[PDB]
Amino acid sequence: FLSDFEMMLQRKKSMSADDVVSAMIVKMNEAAEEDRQLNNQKKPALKKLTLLPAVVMHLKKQDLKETFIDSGVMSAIKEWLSPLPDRSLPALKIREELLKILQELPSVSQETLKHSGIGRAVMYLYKHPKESRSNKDMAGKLINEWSRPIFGLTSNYKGMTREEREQRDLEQMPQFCARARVPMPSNKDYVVRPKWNVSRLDKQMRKFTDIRKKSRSAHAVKISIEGNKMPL
Amino acid sequence: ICEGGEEMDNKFGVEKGHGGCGRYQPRIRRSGLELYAEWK
Amino acid sequence: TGTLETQFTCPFCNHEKSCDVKMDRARNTGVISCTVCLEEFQTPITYLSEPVDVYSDWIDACEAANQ
Amino acid sequence: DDEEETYRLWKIRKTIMQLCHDRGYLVTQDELDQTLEEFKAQFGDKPSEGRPRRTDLTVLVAHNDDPTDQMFVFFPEEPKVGIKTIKVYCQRMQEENITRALIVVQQGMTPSAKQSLVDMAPKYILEQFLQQELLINITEHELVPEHVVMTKEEVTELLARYKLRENQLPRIQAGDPVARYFGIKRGQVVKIIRPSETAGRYITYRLVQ
Amino acid sequence: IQRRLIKSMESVMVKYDATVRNSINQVVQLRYGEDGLAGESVEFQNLATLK
Amino acid sequence: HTTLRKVTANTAIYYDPNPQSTVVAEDQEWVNVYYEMPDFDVARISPWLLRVELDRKHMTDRKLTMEQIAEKINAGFGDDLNCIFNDDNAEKLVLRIRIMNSDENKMQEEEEVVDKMDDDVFLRCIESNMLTDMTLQGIEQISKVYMHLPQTDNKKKIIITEDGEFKALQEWILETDGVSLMRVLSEKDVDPVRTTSNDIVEIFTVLGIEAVRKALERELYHVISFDGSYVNYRHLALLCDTMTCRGHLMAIT
Ligand SMILES: [Zn+2]
Incomplete structure (x- = not known):
């Protein structure tokens, strides 16, 4: 039989998906198609905008971003960013959140952009005249961010190796007073990288510290003297 | 860490986790009137 | 007058406050590394040695080597 | 020193008997006024490596108006009490179905144990006293x-x-x-x-x- | 010191219940001064039956 | 509180590689006795010697004996610090402390033994540690203790005679500098009923909020009645009730 102590300990100890991602993408396609039908009926296309919170709250899950990208999220986002039958842009919220998500979804490979058409779908919004300036800036930076890899460029300055900088620095090398005067830092351009210039007491002190601790007039429950850190 | 990032909360028609995003949280620091976020 | 500096501008990539000093008081050696370009230098220290002394040894080695 | 340790063990036991009597447990006048000589005679005189080992001092006492309501007093021998020790007391309590216990720890007890004491609180009420506090x-x-x-x-x-x-x-x-x-x-x-x-x-x- | 004192006790008073409560209606004293009497009327006396 | 510094007259560190022919002439006559029957492995005695000579005035003034100090030193340090001492009847009260070595330090035949400090500097550290931190007698945090025959009746014991007279009794009371109310209260022969700290924070930690109310009202009455002026008990009782209404010492700040 279990002891009440072990029941308590086990009870407290007891406190410590690709299929649902696929189903989410299916629901995103259903929502965008229903909004196409509603737009043809000249009704408000609420389905995408009604699902948006649930979708955004899941695309942010760091542990699933690979699953999301590999499951065809880029295709669904392209469908949501695409203009409707009357060539109107999607709800402002959809553009704002999906563009922000795409910035936070950097693992996207070139083949993924080319196959999903998400690049076309964002370049479209970047060119589009009815797009707001903030969305145009997001689309612009997305287009730069996604095109740099095509040209092998990169924007992470911490990404260039040490030897690359040392080599580049060699590639770029050219051919009275009455009081103390504060000297100013050397402006010299350093090219060349310099070669490097290369207990019995604490046991007794710990023992004495332990004796000091042992001598204290401590109490089992720390009484709040002035009401600070009062429990519950 | 924003725990429970491993699970889809909405079942999309298919005891409860925290349902977080799994992201590591920044430690925020104040410098006079400006706020800075630092990730370890 | 004021408080002594503890973060420095990498004398190579000039990125501000990018270099930090690790002081191995046990092996008597200080290590400085640029958290941007990853450049490093190591110099013998003493118990009097402060981060500003390591950084100076780096600057003195650079100033001597760039001649 | 056995003479000072026997004095302290007797003084804490005397305070614990007064505490039990005031909490309304049943304690006899002989236990309540027991002198140091009569203590040495009963529990012994050599606590360092000898007869009053602290496991020998445990008191079990019954509420004066409900004899099924009972409280242990435990004197751990361990200087600092840990989770495993509390586990021993919780088992000994569950076996006797005694719901209250008072642990007279010598040094403090581990934050983990302090936690387990309140974690058990709904079913078993067990509380702690430093022996330093019971000398008076x-x-x-x-x-x-x-x-x-x-x-x-x-x-x-x-x-x-x-x-x-x-x-x-x-x-x-x-x-x-x-x-x-x-x-x-x-x-x-x-x-x-x-x-x-x-x-x-x-x-x-x-x-x- | 006088400011600190008044700012700390300015709301304490005797209610019609003859209990002494504060702004939060927390009962401070069940009777004012443990005996319920004003300071102007009491006087010094000797207890003959003591000692 | 009596530390080894309080009783020490002089300390000295010597290079005394052989105690059987010690560099100190005063000690040869008595040192032989400990090496004639060693309670320790003589192969472990460090050649550096810390000789401490104690002031007989400061020792007898507080009923101390060499054996007690040696017990305290051996307990605080241990097997690693051997202490030898002169008989209390000799002209000079002397201790001879030496570092004991270790077999674990012999095993490292070629490794860099950086974790081991030089014995002479180690002794100078142990002296600066032991002199001010070695509690020989008393309770820490109590700087000094006065002895007094109370004059104020509230400090005298008062106990009723069989015929009913109150009959105050004057008893020696100790008035300390510094406090440790719980330890002092548990000392035997200390009256635990009346001994008090005159420090309300101690009262809260040791006797609780209601005890705090009582103690605060008395200390406040003490200061307000020092010059002999009078304030009705209502104003003190009201102030102390508000400062303790919430179960904790609510500062008037
Ligand atoms: Zn989160």
């Missing part, structure tokens, strides 16, 4: 007046006579040395009988919270 019965001091835990039937009356919400009474914290001595827990009310140089006597109450 604080209720004996001239500053400390007479505290009386009030039964719930009479606190209903108290709150009805004064037309007073329980939140309006003076407070006492459960970590308070006398809330600890009488073993009270929050929401319980303490009556307090104090002498008065202007009235002669003054009775007041303190809610545990």
